[PDB]
From a paper:
Ene-reductases (ERs), NAD(P)H-dependent flavoproteins from the old yellow enzyme (OYEs) family, are powerful biocatalysts for the asymmetric reduction of activated alkenes, generating the products up to two new stereogenic centers with excellent enantioselectivities. The sequence alignments showed that AfOYE1 conserved the two fingerprint motifs of the thermophilic-like OYE homologs and the catalytic residues of OYEs, including His211, His214, and Tyr216.
The UV–VIS absorption spectra of the purified AfOYE1, released flavin, and standard FMN suggested that AfOYE1 contained an FMN molecule as its prosthetic group and the FMN was non-covalently bound to the protein. The further crystal structure of AfOYE1 revealed that the “cap” region from Ala132 to Thr182, the loop of Ser316 to Gly325, α short helix of Arg371 to Gln375, and the C-terminal “finger” structure endow the catalytic cavity of AfOYE1 quite deep and narrow, and flavin mononucleotide (FMN) heavily buried at the bottom of the active site tunnel. As shown by the difference electron density map Fo-Fc, the si-face of the FMN faced the solvent, while the re-side was in contact with the protein backbone tightly via the extensive hydrogen bonding and hydrophobic interactions with the side chain and main chain elements. Meanwhile, the histidine pair (His211/His214) together with the highly conserved proton donor Tyr216 interacts with a buffer-sourced chloride anion and is positioned on the si-face of the isoalloxazine ring of FMN. It indicated that His/His together with Tyr 216 participated in the binding and correct orientation of substrate. The superposition structures of AfOYE1 with BfOYE4 and AnOYE8, with an r.m.s.d. of 0.694 Å and 0.588 Å, respectively, showed that they have similar monomer folding, except the α6-helix for the residues (from Phe271 to Glu280), the loop region (from Ser316 to Gly325), and the cap subdomain region (from Ala132 to Thr182). The protruding α6-helix and the long N-terminal loops of AfOYE1 work dimerization function in multi-asymmetry units. The loop region from Ser316 to Gly325 runs on the enzyme surface and reaches the active site entrance, which contributes to the size and feature of the catalytic cavity. The C-terminal α helix of each monomer (from Thr395 to Phe401) points to the active sites of the adjacent monomer, and the “finger” residue Trp399 interacts with the respective FMN flavin group at a distance of 3.8 Å. The novel structure of the loop of Ser316 to Gly325 narrows the entrance of the catalytic pocket.
Author numbering:
A (entry chain B): 15 to 402
B (entry chain A): 15 to 18, 21 to 402
The structure:
């Protein structure tokens, strides 16, 4: 073989330097070149759940610049489980082909790509956040307010959201099968990893939290009952995806009520960090490789933790990681917006960090972090050449 | 109508800089005067655009350059710079480029493409392999088939000696430039640029260093500019009258600024000739000239340099000479918003940036921040700042 090109590592490889952040991480059959992941970040740009060239150019522009793993936004496992009418879906076989075009591009760059499987439950059929932080998408704009579902018939915010329909046991069986089928579709779309969304007040968190889950069947009313649907979904997803495939779960570490004097009185039973630790070990027992630690979402008084400060919920990730040790990988997310902070989080014992907004603000976040840390991390050949 | 506006990304929503003020050419309005300069990606096979080009251009267009000019795109197969260049020499090239213009248009953005021919600098390797070396046939090259006005290699002992274009070859070449322009129109580009710079084919005719012909295409100024004037006429005859037509020139071979190089190359391409040419181009429906420099010789490299605004003065000299008869853009190290605004406030109509966009696709927002103004991004991108 003549004129063989010089071999190069994937973009995102630490070619000079010894930071932990830009050191590789292997989970089962996949090696990520570094531990700075793109967090799932809804784009509100789809019709009928299909990815289009917005998603391809958005994700592709970031993947050119070497995140260790690029996790695609919340992708609904049921049509009625979309957050907005503009969400991605994996509930139709037709969804596979456009997503495959994105994974193909990532793989042309020798990059790793994942997707977050999701269901919004009682927070479904809402409008994009630039229209409202919480308002219904009515049927005339593609909404389905009459068809949203939940563990209990309680609206997210009364007077704003539709009252959800209560899932029956049969409905829960169908839901679990649909989660598994969406996972099978993600595999057919050639994703390298899958994440289950169990956070941010969406359907699985609605079962986890006694604030939203008032059921008295086997899916509510005790810790074992409240985590049951998530544990069952993890088992059934693991049963249908390759054993080589990393399985991630994103959780809300707490409803935050436990940390405020008044809110604890108002909601004396809620989802808490101690329950998250207990849950994390049960997840590890079912083949979940990594848990990403966010927080919030279950109530108007408990927003999704999208905040303005640095590393604002790293401490939850650290408490969980201290409790679980090497039995489970942990990633932190939230305001991890400089290289110094990202490296400090992983040096403290956290296995990886994720950034969401900071990648959309700066698709070259990896190189910014590398520059701050005084190390060299390869970009795409064309991009590195542009610095000449 | 129930449940019913935002301006395009790149619109100055607060502030009064000239840089982020709109510019109208014929039937097209650009929301600002910061353009993405043509920037080869060396990522194509057989001239076809692919998802590298789509994700590269799309990621920049999301962030609102007034006009995104796509890289040198060959009008003949043998006119590619490298075997990895884009082409518009085959109808098959239309649909992949159409996907890119479709995405730009979904963002209400304007997109152009640079039609090009490398002449005696064709069939070279990508620059990270060599600044100048032949792509041999075994790696997709065509050294035996490169063409030029005169049988003189770019660098002797490095580049193949080119075949001399005959009169009939020149007729075919002009028809191929026009056919590529027709294909660019069918791919739904908003604007077209003719590449007449950087030592490539049309500059090879312009400069007496490379053009030693004694037919009607060499040996005098009128003869040396002839092929470019004729190509501009042929292209204008086949594209919409509403379409902006740009030309990129090399302002000079640089030999005129050094006594020894003037002795060694007593006739070369010069700024004064660029001024004369610019007015002839304006007469033929060229709307805007972008001012670069260099390329014709090892002793005259393409001006890709490390300093700020390093050939702004050529653009200013040409703009002073042509006045309102022609629009002028500057390029080269225009890497901060303060500099870009100073350049346009000196009378230049627009500025272009190449490397600085690939380094930072959000260059527009960086420049706007430095200037203390607000320039809209795609809705999703502006939302990510909440
Ligand atoms: C516009 C937007 C969309 C988001 N979409 C998702 C999503 O689809 N899934 C998810 O789990 N989190 C989502 N999040 C939360 C982020 O993944 C992330 O956890 C949060 O923004 C904090 O990290 P950051 O400071 O790096 O952005 C979103 C956040 C924003 C601002
Ligand atoms: C990698 C690379 C590729 C380029 N490709 C082209 C091209 O296709 N056509 C062109 O006219 N100029 C091309 N240029 C020159 C640029 O358009 C630009 O004029 C030059 O890089 C200086 O401007 P800048 O400082 O903004 O990069 C290229 C430059 C580089 C570094
Ligand atoms: Cl979310
Ligand atoms: Cl060039």
């Amino acid at each position: 073989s003549y004129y063989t090109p010089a071999q190069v590592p994937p973009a995102g490889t630490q070619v000079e330097g010894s930071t932990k952040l830009f050191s590789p991480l292997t989970i089962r059959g996949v090696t990520f070149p570094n531990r700075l992941f793109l967090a799932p970040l809804c784009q509100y740009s789809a019709k009928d759940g299909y990815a289009n060239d917005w998603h391809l150019t958005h994700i592709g522009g970031i993947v050119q610049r070497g995140p260790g793993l690029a996790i695609m936004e919340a992708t609904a496992v049921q049509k009625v489980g979309r957050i907005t009418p503009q969400d991605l879906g994996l509930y139709d076989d037709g969804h596979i082909e456009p997503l495959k075009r994105i994974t193909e591009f990532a793989h042309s760059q020798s990059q790793k790509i994942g997707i977050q499987l999701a269901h919004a439950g009682r927070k479904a059929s809402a409008v994009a956040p630039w229209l409202s932080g919480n308002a219904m998408a009515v049927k005339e704009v593609g909404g389905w307010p009459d068809d949203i579902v939940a563990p209990s018939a309680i609206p997210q915010e009364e007077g704003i959201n539709a009252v959800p329909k209560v899932l029956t046991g049969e409905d829960i069986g169908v839901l679990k099968k649909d989660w598994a089928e969406a996972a099978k579709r993600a595999v057919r779309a050639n994703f390298d990893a899958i994440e289950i969304h169990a956070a941010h007040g969406y359907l699985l968190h609605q079962f986890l939290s006694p604030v939203s889950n008032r059921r008295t069947d086997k899916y509510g009313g005790s810790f074992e009952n409240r985590v049951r649907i998530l544990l069952e979904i993890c088992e059934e997803v693991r049963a249908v995806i390759p054993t080589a495939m990393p399985l991630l779960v994103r959780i809300s570490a707490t409803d935050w009520f436990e940390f405020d004097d008044n809110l604890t009185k108002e909601f004396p039973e809620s989802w808490t960090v101690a329950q998250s630790i207990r849950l994390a070990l049960l997840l590890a027992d079912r083949g979940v490789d990594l848990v990403d630690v966010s927080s919030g979402g279950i109530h108007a008084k408990s927003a999704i933790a999208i905040r303005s400060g640095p590393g604002y919920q790293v401490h939850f990730a650290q408490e969980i990681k201290k409790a679980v040790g090497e039995k489970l990988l942990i990633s932190a997310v939230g305001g991890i917006k400089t290289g110094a902070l990202a490296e400090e989080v992983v040096q403290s014992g956290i296995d990886a960090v994720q950034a969401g907004r900071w990648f959309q603000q700066n698709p070259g976040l990896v190189r910014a972090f590398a520059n701050e840390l005084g190390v060299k991390v390869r970009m795409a050949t064309q991009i590195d050449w542009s610095f000449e």
